[PDB]
Design a protein around this ligand. Sequence first.
Ligand code: LBM
Length: 141
Amino acid sequence: GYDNREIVMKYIHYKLSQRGYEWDAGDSEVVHLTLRQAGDDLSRRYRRDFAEMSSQLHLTPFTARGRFATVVEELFRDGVNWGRIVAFFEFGGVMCVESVNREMSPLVDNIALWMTEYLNRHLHTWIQDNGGWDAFVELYG
Ligand SMILES: CC1(C)CCC(CN2CCN(c3ccc(C(=O)NS(=O)(=O)c4ccc(NCC5CCOCC5)c([N+](=O)[O-])c4)c(Oc4cnc5[nH]ccc5c4)c3)CC2)=C(c2ccc(Cl)cc2)C1
């Protein structure tokens, strides 16, 4: 079936490579393509929000997890839908890009871990019960 670690790895590798960043640890195909196209589209529609988020993160090694948790909680405070999940992936991408910009590339591995466990444990039942990634693909692919 669907592999959350693979979904996270391919998405973060795509987003980083797209902007010229490296990630050695990253360096069913329809789900990966649909997700990255949806995330690209979201980032174009809400470019101002993304640019403001990138500017405000101010990451350090000891604060990165708290910044991640703080934004994810606000993102889903009104409930989960597919668009907020795409935003969750795009935010992870922004977290990874800013980690490298602050000379903290090792954080990319941690962020990828946090995203994977969020899918595995926090979002898993919602995704499964609302049709899984196959429904996401039929809706937006
Ligand atoms: C602290 C913060 C919380 C503050 C706020 C923000 C920014 N906010 C986050 C929430 N946000 C949302 C949330 C839900 C929806 C939505 O409509 N939901 S929906 O009805 O389920 C759905 C509807 C369409 C598609 N797809 C279209 C297809 C078109 C053809 O091409 C393929 C895709 C999908 N879908 O999943 O694909 C799902 C949405 O509107 C859209 C509009 N266009 C979209 N395109 C792709 C997804 C999508 C969603 C936008 C707006 C921006 C913060 C923030 C900052 C930086 C980063 Cl980095 C991240 C977050 C932080």
